[PDB]
């Protein structure tokens, strides 16, 4: 009923933060501190929407995308990261992100931005 | 045809951008200053305006809160470098459909766009 998010972020402070303010009303998140908890906590048919950076201790948020695409083509993810540069940002487009969202950002921007893709993920009535 | 009102004083960008979009299928009317965008925005007529925040004869936001006021459901993004923290949150609180950043390559815009066009206007 309640979207479930994979929340891949590393930073505690921010990461708690975000789990927090999503859980509040609307999401419920499983929240991975590194890419191979992310492994674990990801399995088809698990998520609504995956959120995640792109440098982990342990990885790339890139090829951690790479990977849920081949195993799922239409999770939707997107990106919420410190390099947003126009690369970046292409190569999260070309890839399929749903999103890219700079840091650093106000929270109610990336609720807005993260309704929006929400509700892309709605059937057609 | 959807119609984009563009609203970009560089003219080397702007020349670019009308291009490709019409050889899209888009009707593109291009403005370079606030003065004409004003002058060019009706209601009823546009499907997405294009604008920046930086303009010669002042700041998009006033543009962006005119149209708003006019027309509060007319999709509209921003394509600019004061593409910072405060200024994206304005953008969104306001409604922007989406906020790109400049630099930008090409196709980053079009894939972009393509999506913000793509959505349902009004409520069927």
């Known amino acids: 009923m309640k979207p479930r998010i994979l929340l891949v972020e590393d930073d505690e402070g921010l990461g708690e933060t975000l789990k927090e303010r999503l859980e509040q009303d609307k999401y419920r998140v499983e929240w991975a501190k590194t890419i191979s908890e992310a492994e674990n906590l990801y399995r088809p048919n698990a998520f609504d929407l995956v ?4 440098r982990l201790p342990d990885g790339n948020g890139f090829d951690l995308a790479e990977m849920i695409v081949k195993k799922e083509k239409d999770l939707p993810f997107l990106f919420l990261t410190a390099q947003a540069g126009a690369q970046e ?5 070309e890839l399929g992100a749903a ?4 840091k650093p950002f106000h929270l109610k921007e990336f609720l807005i931005r993260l309704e929006r893709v929400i509700s892309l993920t709605r059937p057609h009535y």
Not at 51 to 54: G, M, Q, S
Not at 89 to 93: D, E, I, T
Not at 99 to 102: M, R, Y
Request: glycine share 8%; no cysteine; net charge neutral.
């Open 51 to 54: 959120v995640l950076d792109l």
């Open 89 to 93: 940002r292409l190569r999260g487009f």
């Open 99 to 102: 999103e890219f969202i700079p």
